[PDB]
């Protein structure tokens, strides 16, 4: 009768969420100043890649950015003068994640080879070389995020996230219980919790130190492709394969707002927030990115310069730019 | 500060002389999926398998590490030139499970330009599996080969040719000329299987160019 009592437990959380549900924020934020139409023009355009670009991560210096494409190249750009600082070749041609270290010294990438590699780029001996590869996953890697210069969390396609250690190559903790390809992850500002969306329409809050699960959010109806995090640490947004972004608050354990329109039939592939958390940038499959307001769902601005898809998107730590990589091998920096 | 910008463009143009050298070796190698298996029916003769026919580099990749669900990693093979779809001809209705995988590759939003090369393997064990199949497909008893010829037995020829026309009903229903299917039969005589992909990938580039020039 373990499944029979689970319906009593699942209906216990459902009616408890109606106890805290008093008014949606669309009725609360009805007395705020709207932002209106914004216009982002393409400032720079980094043209150095030969295949589809699957991930970029902006460095914490707000100057450099790493991008990864599926021809076996990891190019560290310089977003002010469009100069290629480095151009690393990879062992596997199919990569779908990349990450810049918050000290600037390291860079990471993984893909269909089930291996997170680490490349040390601030070396005084020679050129860039692979530091240590992390092979413990039985599925493709989807997202990589550095905690410090010694710890990294990697989500994979074998339903399990994993906190690693760069020294000795061993997994410190592990996170199980998604039942779906974990497609992305994010990180907290204080770096003690992290969320992870997967292919079972369920984002899931975790714990780095304890290695346990805190909460589980279920409001989507298809596979979750991207996730981000609100800058204060109290909420996160989540885009899925059904043209809907939903803002979940992790202190009321339910949704706040749903960002959708009538004439959008594509899916989200990238979600990020601004610096003040007022604009929500979302990349789509019909080649253009929309700029949703976070409080109202007013659909402020549309930026369109791409050709084949929009696969990745990022906002700098000072909020001065937005770079959208795409499947036509061109990064474009918007401002 | 002035010497820092001179050191920046010196490191820039050194990279540009390597990216343009790597571009001409990237556009000279043809990538290939292999969505069958490494079952040595068409695998030991030909993840990275690299061969070379007529001084052309081919890049065949058998993806095996992924577990069951392919709806997220198969869309990273949309810049490929062809998908090789090795499938055994001869329980639990293993043929219809491949008939629905081919129907899903053909109708994807991203693999709707890739042209499948279909290998109908396990051919030498089909003659033993036909003389004892027809209950799984009731239209097999009412079907006859119209005009094709040049195969042993007439019962095993009609049984083999029924499987090939089962795939072409899907391949000729929503193609619109952007991609075709290239069915073949092979069984352990796979010395003439490496050139069979070479002659088929040559026709994929030619029909790609002729349709761009509005000649097909």
């Amino acid at each position, epitope marked *: 009768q373990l499944r029979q009592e689970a319906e009593q437990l699942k209906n216990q959380i459902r009616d408890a969420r109606k106890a805290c549900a008093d008014a949606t924020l669309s009725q609360i934020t009805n007395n705020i100043d709207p932002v209106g139409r914004i216009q982002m023009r393409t400032r720079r355009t980094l043209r150095g890649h030969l295949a589809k670009i699957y991930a970029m991560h902006w460095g914490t210096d707000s100057r450099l950015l790493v991008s990864a494409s599926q021809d076996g190249k990891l190019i560290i750009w310089d977003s002010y003068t469009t100069n290629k600082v480095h151009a690393i070749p990879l062992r596997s041609s199919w990569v779908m994640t990349c990450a810049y270290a918050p000290s600037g010294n390291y860079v990471a990438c993984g893909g269909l080879d089930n291996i997170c590699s680490i490349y040390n780029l601030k070396t005084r001996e020679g050129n860039v070389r692979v530091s240590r590869e992390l092979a413990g996953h039985t599925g493709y890697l989807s997202c990589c995020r550095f905690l410090d210069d010694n710890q990294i969390v990697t989500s994979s396609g074998d339903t399990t996230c994993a906190l690693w250690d760069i020294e000795t190559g061993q997994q410190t903790t592990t996170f199980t219980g998604h039942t779906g390809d974990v497609m992305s992850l994010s990180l907290a500002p204080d770096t003690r919790l992290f969320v992870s969306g997967a292919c079972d329409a369920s984002a899931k809050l975790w714990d780095v130190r304890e290695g346990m699960c805190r909460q589980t959010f279920t409001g989507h109806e298809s596979d979750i492709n991207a996730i981000c995090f609100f800058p204060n640490g109290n909420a996160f947004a989540t885009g899925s394969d059904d043209a809907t972004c939903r803002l979940f608050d992790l202190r009321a354990d339910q949704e706040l707002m749903t960002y959708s329109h009538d004439n959008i039939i594509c899916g989200i592939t990238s979600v990020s927030f601004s610096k003040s958390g007022r604009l929500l940038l979302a990349g789509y499959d019909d080649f253009n990115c929309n700029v949703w307001d976070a409080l109202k769902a007013d659909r402020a601005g549309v930026l369109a310069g791409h050709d084949n898809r929009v696969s990745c998107l990022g906002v700098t730590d000072d909020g001065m730019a937005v770079a959208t990589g795409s499947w036509d091998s061109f990064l474009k920096i918007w401002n | 500060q002035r010497n820092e910008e001179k050191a920046q463009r010196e490191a820039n143009k050194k990279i540009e002389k390597q990216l343009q050298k790597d571009k001409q070796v990237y556009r000279a190698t043809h990538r290939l999926l292999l969505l069958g298996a490494g079952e040595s029916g068409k695998s030991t003769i030909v993840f990275e398998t690299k061969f070379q026919v007529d001084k052309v580099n081919f890049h065949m990749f058998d993806v095996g590490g992924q577990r069951d669900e392919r709806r997220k990693w198969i869309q990273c093979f949309n810049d490929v030139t062809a998908i090789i779809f090795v499938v055994a001809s001869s329980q639990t209705n293993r043929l219809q499970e491949a008939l629905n995988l081919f129907k899903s*590759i053909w109708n994807n939003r991203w693999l709707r330009t890739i042209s499948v090369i279909l290998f109908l393997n396990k051919q030498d064990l089909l003659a033993e599996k036909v003389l004892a199949i027809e*209950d799984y497909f009731p239209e097999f008893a009412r079907y006859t080969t119209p005009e094709d010829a040049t195969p042993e037995d007439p019962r095993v020829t009609r049984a083999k040719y029924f499987i090939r026309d089962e795939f072409l009903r899907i391949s000729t229903a929503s193609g619109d000329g952007r991609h075709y299917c290239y069915p073949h039969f092979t069984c352990a005589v796979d010395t003439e299987n490496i050139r069979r992909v070479f002659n088929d990938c040559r026709d994929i580039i030619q029909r790609m160019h002729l349709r761009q020039y509005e000649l097909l």
Partner: nanobody
Amino acid sequence: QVQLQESGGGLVQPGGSLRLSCAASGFTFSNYKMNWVRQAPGKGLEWVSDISQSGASISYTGSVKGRFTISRDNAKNTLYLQMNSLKPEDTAVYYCARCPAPFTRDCFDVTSTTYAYRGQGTQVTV
């Protein structure tokens, strides 16, 4: 929270009739293509039939052609499989799967296990 709850089934005589119904809550029913997947004891999962998101296209496994049928009702969100002329080789657990994405022509459907959009399955035996 998505839900695919099936009903019907039971132990009948070989040659009778059955009607399974699948009530779906949590998603818009009108814009997904639905499926019926059975699993025989000892065997893996095996696809049976499907239906498009409006009722136009309807396909079957050839081994169940003529006997079975499949219908939708997009106003009450229920998926039906009317079964006639059963057989001792038809005893299976019948799941009610669906497409992973809306407005989508293809589907990458049922696996070894752990497909995210599926029901518990009602036992059907003869």
